[PDB]
Amino acid sequence: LSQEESTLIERATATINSIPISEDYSVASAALSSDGRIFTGVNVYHFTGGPCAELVVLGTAAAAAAGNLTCIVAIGNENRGILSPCGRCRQVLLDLHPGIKAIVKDSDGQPTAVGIRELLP
Amino acid sequence: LSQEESTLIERATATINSIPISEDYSVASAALSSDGRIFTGVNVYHFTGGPCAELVVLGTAAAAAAGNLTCIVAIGNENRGILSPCGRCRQVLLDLHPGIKAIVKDSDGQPTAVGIRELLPS
Amino acid sequence: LSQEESTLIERATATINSIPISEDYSVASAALSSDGRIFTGVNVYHFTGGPCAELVVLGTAAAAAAGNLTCIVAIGNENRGILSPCGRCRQVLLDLHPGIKAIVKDSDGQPTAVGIRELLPSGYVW
Amino acid sequence: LSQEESTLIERATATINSIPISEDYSVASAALSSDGRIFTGVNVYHFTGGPCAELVVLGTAAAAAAGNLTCIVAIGNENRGILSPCGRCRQVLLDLHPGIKAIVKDSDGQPTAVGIRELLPS
Numbered sequence: 076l077s078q079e080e081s082t083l084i085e086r087a088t089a090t091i092n093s094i095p096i097s098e099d100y101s102v103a104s105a106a107l108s109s110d111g112r113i114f115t116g117v118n119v120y121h122f123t124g125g126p127c128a129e130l131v132v133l134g135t136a137a138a139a140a141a142g143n144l145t146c147i148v149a150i151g152n153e154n155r156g157i158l159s160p161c162g163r164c165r166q167v168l169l170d171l172h173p174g175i176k177a178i179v180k181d182s183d184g185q186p187t188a189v190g191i192r193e194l195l196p
Numbered sequence: 197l198s199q200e201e202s203t204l205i206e207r208a209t210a211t212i213n214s215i216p217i218s219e220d221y222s223v224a225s226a227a228l229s230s231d232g233r234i235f236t237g238v239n240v241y242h243f244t245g246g247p248c249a250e251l252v253v254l255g256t257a258a259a260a261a262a263g264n265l266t267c268i269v270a271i272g273n274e275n276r277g278i279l280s281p282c283g284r285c286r287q288v289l290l291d292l293h294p295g296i297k298a299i300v301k302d303s304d305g306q307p308t309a310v311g312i313r314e315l316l317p318s
Numbered sequence: 319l320s321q322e323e324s325t326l327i328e329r330a331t332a333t334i335n336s337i338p339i340s341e342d343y344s345v346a347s348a349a350l351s352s353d354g355r356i357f358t359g360v361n362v363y364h365f366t367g368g369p370c371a372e373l374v375v376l377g378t379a380a381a382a383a384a385g386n387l388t389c390i391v392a393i394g395n396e397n398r399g400i401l402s403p404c405g406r407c408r409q410v411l412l413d414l415h416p417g418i419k420a421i422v423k424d425s426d427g428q429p430t431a432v433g434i435r436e437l438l439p440s441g442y443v444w
Numbered sequence: 445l446s447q448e449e450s451t452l453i454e455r456a457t458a459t460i461n462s463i464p465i466s467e468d469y470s471v472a473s474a475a476l477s478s479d480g481r482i483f484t485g486v487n488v489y490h491f492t493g494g495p496c497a498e499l500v501v502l503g504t505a506a507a508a509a510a511g512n513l514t515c516i517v518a519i520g521n522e523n524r525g526i527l528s529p530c531g532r533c534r535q536v537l538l539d540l541h542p543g544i545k546a547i548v549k550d551s552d553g554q555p556t557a558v559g560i561r562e563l564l565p566s
């Protein structure tokens with residue numbers, strides 16, 4: 076990944092580590108816009124489909140007229156590190172930001188940014 | 197409404213008015229935390245249940261360690277004004293912020309802050 | 319409560335008592351069509367918003383070309399009895415079957431059918 | 445494609461073709477259980493995440509104590525044929541029926557049954 080993309084990991088990690096330990100708010104996400112800005116968010120757990128952290132980030136970016144997002148990552152609390160977006164997120168990301176990459180762990184546990192279509196054939 | 201509650205309407209209105217007209221991003225929301233901070237967000241439309249503006253606000257508040265939220269409102273694009281929270285939002289709000297009020301239009305069309313339970317009556 | 323409405327309770331109760339005890343599948347629902355038919359369903363728990371039992375009923379009715387539904391009820395496992403529809407279900411029910419009633423417990427814990435609009439005052443509309 | 449896989453396509457197709465054309469109810473799904481039954485369903489469109497046809501099938505199978513589902517397909521109205529499950533369905537399917545296959549179109553447009561994990565690659 077680029078150093079710009081590497082900053083997303085730092086930002087999402089700082090976000091989740093900065094809030095009280097919660098079962099409702101347990102994952103942070105950060106995304107990079109095509110114009111260089113970073114947007115963050117935290118998940119909202121609910122059985123009716125409370126948004127994943129990634130979806131909160133999408134709404135936060137949209138609130139800032141961010142336009143295209145080029146990369147996204149999610150980081151779990153309790154030092155869990157990078158978590159791949161769930162299938163719901165993969166679908167919303169493909170549909171609203173088809174040019175986006177997601178940061179996931181490679182075969183060696185190392186961060187890599189992959190095109191959303193690779194995660195949702 | 198209280199002065200603070202009125203400010204939520206202004207903030208959410210400014211937020212939705214500021215972004216490109218979109219079918220995907222068409223409602224803004226603003227919520228007040230107990231400490232007086234305001235958090236905003238815009239909906240993300242998706243058939244799988246992309247979050248309402250209110251839920252984006254909840255995640256934005258949580259990201260800032262806002263704690264308990266006391267009031268929330270949603271404002272539609274294209275001068276639609278106050279929109280009540282939908283049923284899913286009411287459930288999430290009740291479960292995560294039971295002390296919260298939502299701003300809705302009363303029977304005379306005037307803004308009123310209503311306890312979340314009163315929006316999910318028995 | 320009408321005889322037909324009461325049958326919804328019996329049916330949903332039968333359904334939840336006819337499946338293994340599960341944390342994924344823990345509530346049953348039944349609805350009545352204007353054509354007299356009854357449609358059932360159970361919930362599918364998932365954090366991304368797996369459907370409530372009521373929503374599974376809606377898709378089951380739709381698969382049978384049921385048309386308009388007039389009443390719905392949900393019955394919980396662990397002998398919980400009648401469970402009011404959640405906010406999400408209230409919205410979907412109002413939007414897709416605006417004339418529907420939901421069976422809920424009254425003050426004395428007894429079954430009563432109320433109009434969906436009564437369960438969502440000051441509705442989201444534009 | 446095996447006999448039972450072709451049969452699921454036929455059952456889902458008959459289901460969607462048998463109901464009035466609707467923007468709310470526009471996709472049917474069918475799934476096979478290991479105990480020798482087939483369950484159908486149609487989608488319920490709603491912005492809060494009304495269930496996909498596949499999720500209606502999952503609740504219909506659950507209502508019948510079906511246990512393990514081994515194959516699923518979705519068929520669109522107006523002669524659209526096979527539709528791949530969306531990302532949310534893939535996630536729910538993986539989590540609740542990890543042994544399931546979904547019928548999708550291959551590169552030639554022909555039906556193929558693929559393990560659910562293949563549809564959510566790393």
Ligand SMILES: CN(CC[C@H](N)CC(=O)N[C@H]1C=C[C@H](n2ccc(O)nc2=O)O[C@@H]1C(=O)O)C(=N)N
Binds near residue numbers: 098120162
């Ligand atoms: C009954 N509960 C739920 C407790 C759950 N054990 C929390 C959980 O699993 N949360 C996960 C859901 C969203 C979430 N998530 C999942 C997928 C994705 O793409 N993005 C996310 O933010 O990660 C969370 C996590 O792993 O901690 C509460 N009291 N809140």
Ligand SMILES: CN(CC[C@H](N)CC(=O)N[C@H]1C=C[C@H](n2ccc(O)nc2=O)O[C@@H]1C(=O)O)C(=N)N
Binds near residue numbers: 249270283442
């Ligand atoms: C993307 N689309 C779908 C267009 C939909 N007709 C938009 C809509 O109704 N959106 C509503 C969903 C969320 C949303 N909302 C709804 C309820 C609620 O509690 N909060 C919200 O943010 O308001 C939106 C609105 O009214 O504009 C297309 N390209 N055709």
Ligand SMILES: CN(CC[C@H](N)CC(=O)N[C@H]1C=C[C@H](n2ccc(O)nc2=O)O[C@@H]1C(=O)O)C(=N)N
Binds near residue numbers: 402
């Ligand atoms: C970690 N988990 C989740 C366990 C939950 N404690 C189950 C639950 O609360 N389920 C509720 C969600 C849907 C659901 N429901 C809720 C509202 C509504 O309107 N209809 C429903 O079917 O009722 C269920 C119930 O009360 O048993 C799993 N292993 N599955």
Ligand SMILES: CN(CC[C@H](N)CC(=O)N[C@H]1C=C[C@H](n2ccc(O)nc2=O)O[C@@H]1C(=O)O)C(=N)N
Binds near residue numbers: 486520529
């Ligand atoms: C204006 N509208 C919405 C109309 C939409 N154009 C219908 C749609 O796209 N529906 C899709 C959603 C579910 C759905 N679906 C999608 C994915 C999946 O895995 N299973 C599904 O059943 O397929 C449907 C379809 O393709 O027709 C209403 N008031 N109803």
Ligand SMILES: [Zn+2]
Binds near residue numbers: 127160162164
């Ligand atoms: Zn997700």
Ligand SMILES: [Zn+2]
Binds near residue numbers: 248249250281
């Ligand atoms: Zn809502």
Ligand SMILES: [Zn+2]
Binds near residue numbers: 371372405406407408
């Ligand atoms: Zn519900």
Ligand SMILES: [Zn+2]
Binds near residue numbers: 532
């Ligand atoms: Zn789906």
